């Protein structure tokens, strides 16, 4: 029902990449008619829609892209912009039918950093957008972050699980420490909502997910036990920045 | 010194030509690309475009001109555009010999044996 | 800081209204200057703001109003109109800080039926509003009913536990059984959303509170085990519509 | 019978009955017309409303069509699209028993008086 | 019935210290047995309890300590830590009977900067604490900052009147500009409270105090005339701060 | 930052009881202790200051002691406070002052004792 | 197809509240702005108002105020003209500098130029 | 005699605003108290009264407004509405003392289209109103268009000489080609009047203005040399429209 070339590039990206070697598929893809803008626009869409790939095989797509741009420069910038675009659009529409689609995109963005396609500045800008875009600054729920919506946390942990272990030396070391403190406050904003009672406690899977990611990144750091401690940590962090010029 | 700006949440039925006309006169630029909607997110189609300004001081006027500018689709629904710094600020900076030869390949040829009946 | 009249009314309704002081307080309330438009309006506000009363003392104010209308016929209408207004506004505003405020309101409406302040049509009209207002007909989530938002379930179960036990004879029995068919479909619309996974399941507390109320109402209830089964129940019920409406 | 009580809700809080009576004039025949102000307890969400009971249960079609969605404006100029639907409680105050003898006699009460003694000392 | 040596120290600091006799007092304190830990502690506490000295002679104690550290290197650190501690404890306790005492401690902390005993960071770190410690981020009244409690403002102004004149050059100037942006928002949280009405208005004496110190420090600053104007100015600041963070 | 303050302790704890209660104790070149001054009648608390060699033992030290409830002799609970001291300067080694301990042999002190002799 | 209508050639000494009374009951509308007379043409002073109706199908009736005789306090006919506004755009919804001219060095230099 | 802030905006608009000082005037205009309805009211009136500006510097005011609406979008709407009001009212009043005042207003409307403040439709509806409003269809003179009154021609050429060169591609091409037919007939209605004698001929100055203007827009056409020709071209135009 679909053209044969289109089905072939899909067979390479969504099937052959988790089975064979990335080089076998890379040269196969270099031989595609890249001068034809029709097929080029199609393969880019296939890579952006990485939700069709097995979650554990997504790094193969980043590895492949890192090499394919040595021969098709513009495809690299187009997929990255698309991935970052779908991460934004996913937050705006915020529909449950796109949750697995959005988790993969976040994972893909993390693997694109591991293979040096984007730099930490892009990853930290995306990390903050998860805890700030559509978020009322007073901590009140809003349309884009309703009270019982915890998907922002699952996105932050998805990215931190894939490339946060490399933010432990030099500049990126403390930029991650600074994002975490703002993330712990966002966490406690949600925990402090009235919807969480004794019979309806905070989802325990989210608590385990947060403690696990923090345990890996910073083993010696302990999540706060109150909202006041989190509001202090941010107040102390930004206060010291205001004092150091 | 950021120079790449994105115009997103445009109507899906819009193309590059009516965009360039609407934003006429386009401030000078070495990069100007337009991207259509994904179609797999059926209810939420939005096209977008990227412009890399040569003088990163002309975007203050550009951002105040078109950030929020209401675009119209066929039926007449309002698509207020969004003009921000592109979240990825890199742009396209011999030729390959394999380009355009996949039809003369054994792996592709054998695949056709599987796909056609 | 407050007028003495107003604070006295607040002590009467929020502090002095025990289970056996109802009559004592009613006679204290008959003495109020009801010809004054200001204090009357204020007293009605106090009764609508029922969240200031302890949950288990809410039936007391309903009992109070049932007797107070024998001498002030108009105050009965004004309180119910405000309670039904606040229930609807709660759904339109839908902020967590008003949850206890809205649970108490739903309780009040249930008690007002027990003391013959409203008829069963009011209670059912409101129950359907919990499962239809702001709800998309396809089951998809919306702005007034986000995916993980299950407060409508707790409001429906708050009313059914308060007065649903009186819907088991004659017309009032079938009118409830038809609602529960629609209620079960709304429940299964929530269960079948993508947010609920194997690690983040449908809150068992909500499952528990649903089963407890239906067991309390219809012990033989045929609990739908799927979304399709609840949809069939609705489709079969709508067949009954069009024979009793005259179109099939 | 047929429904006859109509509610006009989600009106601006700063709207008075005279202001509404002018914007609605000339409203059809009605035995009941009451206006109710905002509550203030839900401080961010103040809305006034009115209730009208029509004599002919068919002039509502015209009235609803004229005001269901009508935009009201406050001092700041924010828009308040009104909601005009059947009131969820169809009963109204009916003219009628003998007046109550104790109405307005709380000031001449010992329990109250004692309360004033205790409330006189506050803060 | 006080021991002889102790009363002599109290006479030196609270009575004999009158601006001009400072060198004579310093040499008299150098002769004290500093290696006796007990006597050292009492002397340090005498300087921490600065409320026993006349307000306009408080700077004298700071000058004395500036010369005393040329011979007892540890006492300079001990007094500052004691004063900062007394400031924080004053906020925690928050009882009006200690108000005049807490105003003296702020003056002393201000004078300690004028005599190069504390760095610029300690002053602004203490200033911010006045506007944040025990303060809810939404501007709502709290246990340590009730509605009619405006002592925090009086403390901010006592320090800015003592050493704000020297925050006019380079980085120190920029630090003060940022703090004032936060300080004005705190002021407007207090004004917007429910307790201040037409019959119970915001004390005009506090308004006059605020405008005076601000006009003395920055004569060209535009005062915020609304709680919205204050919240906008703060968001504009932290908007520029996050870009340099990451 | 390396200096840490231990404050809101019991007024009766002396330094070695603190040093005992705070065992094990990471590396620290600075360890000052301050009791409570009698003056402030109702609110008497002792405190301590510690400058850690490697500024990272505070992450382990704070969580171990921040909130540690101490007890007074009469049986009163004292939730402790652990935070970075607001003044981050410490003492360093140095010649001594010749006048130290000479006040007893001074005329001005002598004539004061005379006026103080007759209470 | 249009929705913006102009009510022009009104009396100059007319205010908006008075006009809203004469027009009562107006059809629904998003836009209703009133503009007094300019004073630059003393002999030819006319106020006007613009309305943007929500339903573009009720203008035919409102048009059929076209010729409405408005009167001033002194007494004189001002037959209002109701036509489709020649410009059919209305603005519908902040700057940081708004209201900063008082604290400005060029305007302060101007005050030195104009006050003395 | 006038408050200082009012005299300042007059200095910015009627003196300081030359071709090169627009950038400094804009930022200075953004700081005015736009929340005060009285100041903003007066500002709009100052711009509508474009006759106070040097004719050749009028385009600067349009450019100023084009950027001033990026921060005060409401003000551009009222300035245009006021300009169109004064164009219409100028025709209804029609006194020679307001001629250069109305010439300046017509110029302003043209420049407002150049900086994309009004669409082509607003320009053509005004162009036709000059040749129709107050004009009797049978060609005879009327109260608002007496015989020797040729100011409509002077107005039309004022607008076409400032933005008509931009009407030669696509839709706006046909629209203008059709207005010139009705304009040619109006011109000939005025030429065919009995007031023009040998010693009192049709003003040669105005006819040169017609030839010069039409030369700049469309070099492919010369004005009709006869009234009947102009009538024939209108009849042809309307017939071909009805048939297609
Ligand atoms: Cl105070």
Residue numbers in the entry:
A (entry chain D): 767 to 1011
B (entry chain C): 66 to 158, 163 to 186
C (entry chain B): 767 to 1014
D (entry chain A): 65 to 160, 162 to 188
E (entry chain F): 767 to 1012
F (entry chain E): 67 to 160, 163 to 187
G (entry chain G): 66 to 129, 131 to 159, 164 to 186
H (entry chain H): 767 to 1010
From the publication, what sentences describe this entry?
UPF3 is a key nonsense-mediated mRNA decay (NMD) factor required for mRNA surveillance and eukaryotic gene expression regulation. UPF3 exists as two paralogs (A and B) which are differentially expressed depending on cell type and developmental stage and believed to regulate NMD activity based on cellular requirements. Here, we report two crystal structures of the RRM-L and N-terminal region of the middle-domain of UPF3B and UPF3A bound to the MIF4GIII domain of UPF2.
To further analyze UPF3A’s higher affinity to UPF2-MIF4GIII, we crystallized UPF3A-58–206-Iso1 with UPF2-MIF4GIII. Resulting crystals diffracted to a resolution of 2.95 Å and were phased using the UPF3B-41–189 + UPF2-MIF4GIII structure. One such region is a 6-residue hairpin of the RRM-L between β2 and β3 of UPF3B and UPF3A (N85 and T87 changed to A102 and L104 in UPF3A) where a shift in the register occurs. In UPF3A, the register shift spanning residues 102–109 (85–92 in UPF3B) (compare left and right panels) alters the positions of side chains of both UPF2 and UPF3A. The side chain of residue D103 (D86 of UPF3B which is not involved in binding) binds the pocket and forms a polar contact with the side chain of N815. In the NOPS-L α-helical region of the UPF3A structure, the terminal end is better resolved relative to the UPF3B structure. In summary, UPF3A binds with ∼10-fold higher affinity than UPF3B, mainly relying on an additional interaction between the NOPS-L and UPF2-MIF4GIII domains, and to a lesser extent on a structural rearrangement in the β2-β3 hairpin of the RRM-L domains.
